[PDB]
C-alpha cells in the first residue's frame, strides 16, 4: 500500500462523502498532492446518477 492507494481528503470532504454514500476510494482526487476536492465528489456523483438513470 503506497500513498496512491490511500485516500487524501479534508474532514469536510470526508463528511460530505459519508452523508451521500460516496466511497472516496472510488473518487480520483485532482487537488494538491491528489487530495479529493468537492468538485471531484460532485463529478463522481453526477456520473453515478447518470449510470443509474440509464440502467
Amino acid at each position: 500500500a503506497e500513498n496512491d492507494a490511500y485516500v487524501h481528503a479534508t474532514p469536510l470532504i470526508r463528511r460530505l462523502a459519508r452523508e451521500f454514500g460516496v466511497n472516496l476510494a472510488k473518487v480520483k482526487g485532482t487537488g494538491r498532492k491528489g487530495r479529493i476536492l468537492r468538485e471531484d465528489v460532485q463529478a463522481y456523483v453526477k456520473e453515478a446518477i447518470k449510470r443509474a438513470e440509464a440502467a
Binding site: 481528503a9 479534508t10 459519508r18 491528489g34
Partner: protein, 46 residues
C-alpha cells in the same frame, strides 16, 4: 477513557490528519494543527 459520541466521525478526522502527514508532511500538519487550535479557541476549546 472519555466517551466518543460518534466514532465514525472521529475516524474520519483521524484519517484526515493521517493523510495530511502522509501526503504533505509533518510541517504542513503542524501548521494545520496550529490553525485548528486557534479556531477552536475562538469557539471555546481552551
Amino acid at each position: 477513557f472519555p466517551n466518543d459520541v460518534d466514532p465514525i466521525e472521529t475516524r474520519d478526522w483521524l484519517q484526515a490528519i493521517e493523510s495530511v502527514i502522509r501526503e504533505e508532511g509533518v510541517e504542513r500538519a503542524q501548521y494545520l494543527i496550529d490553525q485548528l487550535l486557534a479556531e477552536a479557541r475562538k469557539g471555546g476549546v481552551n
